[PDB]
Each structure stands twice: as structure tokens, then as C-alpha cells.
Amino acid sequence: MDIVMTQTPVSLAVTPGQSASISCRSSQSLLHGDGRSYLYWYVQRPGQSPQLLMYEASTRVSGVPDRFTGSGSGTDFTLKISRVEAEDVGVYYCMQGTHWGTFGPGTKVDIKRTVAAPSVFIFPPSDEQLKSGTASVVCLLNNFYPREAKVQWKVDNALQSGNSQESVTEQDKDSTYSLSSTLTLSKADYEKHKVYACEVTHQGLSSPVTKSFNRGALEV
């Protein structure tokens, strides 16, 4: 009698770094006389052709990351991921080896985009730009989520507004953003002040972070 394969769950969403384990079930036992159960695990990543991950239920294919392990015998099997990584997105199918048939229904492994606080850094202007008579101070926000972020400039601890421009990258595929905030002053006005600081507000930060530097350059 031909074998019917079923998988659970239909889908799961996890954060990179978590563990996971999906299940596969066969309508008939896959156990052979040699004590081995002929069960394959495949993954189909977006746009790619299926890739073999496991054979004989518990033997990982050479080259497959060691985060993948397999277990099970007879009619019930599991694929285990000790640490889910971003590149594990895809549909995971099981397939029995007793006779030629279709994949199981598959389990789509999604990956949740969590809140990521930005890494903030400030950059004094270069002497080459100061020669042109213009000073541009840059505050960089690297790889954050979600998009909403506030950058408040302060010159000698005076709140600034109207002399800064923001440039954000397109959404990454990590779905994170990177942003630059450039405070532009004349060379004369730049050398009129000592402390330059950017204060970033982002829901990934329990409190707003301030990066500063002291002209003449002490980074605080």
C-alpha cells in the first residue's frame, strides 16, 4: 500500500537564535530490515530548487550546517534546528524512500523581524570639507527596526532645528534600515562652538542615546 505523508505545523515563526523542531508522519512504517527508516528532509528556499538535508531520518548531508539534526523511526520523525538563523527561511518537506512519491505538505519556516535598536555614532567633518567653507557633522544610525527614529541635534547644548538633513536606506532581506543625519554649518559657525551631539530616540532603546564630540577631539 502506498504511503501518505503529513507534516505539522503548517508554519511557524521564530526569532534568529531560537530553537525549533517540526514533525513528519508516514501512514505506513518506513522501517526496513536493516534497522534504518528511509526518510528524507528537504528545504526549498525562495526561488531555489529543493536541497536535501537529511536521509535515513537522522543522517545529515555533508555541507549542511550542523544546526540541523534528525530523529525518529517507523512512522514519526522530527527535524531539529538547535539555532534558527536568518538563512533558514523556506518550506521544509519530508519524503519517504520506500517508493517514489510526492513531498509532504511542507512546513513553512518564517522568521520574525524583531525590534532592533540602532548603533549610533557621530563623525566630525573632514579638513577637506572645512577648506570649502562648509562643515557637515554626521550622526549614523546603523541597521535598526522599525523605521521610526528621531535625531535631535545639539550645538553647545542648544537644541537645533532646520539645519539637518536625513537620508535613509531602502528597507533591507533583513528588513532593517540605516539612516544618516547630517548637520550642516558654515566653517565660521562650526568653529564658533565646542560641543556637538546627536540624541537618537528609538523604541529599541530604553532611553535616548546621545553621541557627542568635543571640538579641539574628545569623543563622549
Side-chain angles (χ1 to χ4, degrees), residues 28 61 90 94 112 122 194 212 214:
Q28 312 293 149
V61 179
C94 63
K112 285 206 263 273
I122 194 169
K194 171 178 129 150
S212 74
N214 208 93

Side-chain angles (χ1 to χ4, degrees), residues 14-16 111-117 143-146 171 173-176:
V14 287
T15 300
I111 289 201
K112 285 206 263 273
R113 173 61 264 172
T114 60
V115 175
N143 310 313
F144 56 91
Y145 189 85
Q171 179 156 219
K173 198 213 177 308
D174 188 20
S175 180
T176 57

Side-chain angles (χ1 to χ4, degrees), residues 56-126:
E56 294 174 354
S58 55
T59 303
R60 186 178 57 247
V61 179
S62 318
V64 171
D66 44 56
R67 320 181 306 264
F68 291 88
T69 47
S71 74
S73 188
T75 61
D76 294 291
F77 309 86
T78 55
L79 179 65
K80 298 163 296 167
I81 307 175
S82 62
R83 197 187 204 275
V84 177
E85 294 300 329
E87 41 282 353
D88 296 328
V89 184
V91 196
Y92 290 77
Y93 307 91
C94 63
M95 178 188 184
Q96 47 89 9
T98 295
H99 69 81
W100 181 254
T102 312
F103 289 162
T107 293
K108 174 92 192 33
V109 169
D110 294 302
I111 289 201
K112 285 206 263 273
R113 173 61 264 172
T114 60
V115 175
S119 296
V120 183
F121 304 95
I122 194 169
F123 294 81
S126 61

Side-chain angles (χ1 to χ4, degrees), residues 30-39 56-57 59 73-74:
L30 308 185
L31 179 62
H32 280 49
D34 52 358
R36 304 168 211 258
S37 293
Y38 289 78
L39 189 270
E56 294 174 354
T59 303
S73 188

Side-chain angles (χ1 to χ4, degrees), residues 66-220:
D66 44 56
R67 320 181 306 264
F68 291 88
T69 47
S71 74
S73 188
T75 61
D76 294 291
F77 309 86
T78 55
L79 179 65
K80 298 163 296 167
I81 307 175
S82 62
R83 197 187 204 275
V84 177
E85 294 300 329
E87 41 282 353
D88 296 328
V89 184
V91 196
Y92 290 77
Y93 307 91
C94 63
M95 178 188 184
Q96 47 89 9
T98 295
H99 69 81
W100 181 254
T102 312
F103 289 162
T107 293
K108 174 92 192 33
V109 169
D110 294 302
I111 289 201
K112 285 206 263 273
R113 173 61 264 172
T114 60
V115 175
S119 296
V120 183
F121 304 95
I122 194 169
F123 294 81
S126 61
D127 286 359
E128 180 67 1
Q129 192 201 21
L130 280 173
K131 284 295 188 177
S132 63
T134 304
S136 300
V137 189
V138 181
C139 191
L140 264 190
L141 281 67
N142 297 276
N143 310 313
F144 56 91
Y145 189 85
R147 164 66 179 84
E148 303 82 83
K150 188 214 192 312
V151 182
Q152 174 66 61
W153 280 100
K154 292 127 67 178
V155 177
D156 279 343
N157 309 289
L159 289 176
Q160 302 290 293
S161 160
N163 52 0
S164 57
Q165 293 194 180
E166 291 185 358
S167 181
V168 62
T169 67
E170 226 154 282
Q171 179 156 219
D172 191 298
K173 198 213 177 308
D174 188 20
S175 180
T176 57
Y177 303 87
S178 289
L179 181 140
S180 76
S181 163
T182 300
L183 178 93
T184 301
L185 306 166
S186 67
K187 175 187 180 297
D189 289 331
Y190 173 72
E191 307 178 318
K192 273 184 175 56
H193 305 288
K194 171 178 129 150
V195 181
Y196 290 83
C198 60
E199 163 173 85
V200 173
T201 304
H202 189 273
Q203 66 170 293
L205 301 160
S206 59
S207 291
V209 294
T210 297
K211 293 316 190 70
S212 74
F213 70 87
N214 208 93
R215 205 193 40 101
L218 306 95
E219 294 257 9
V220 197

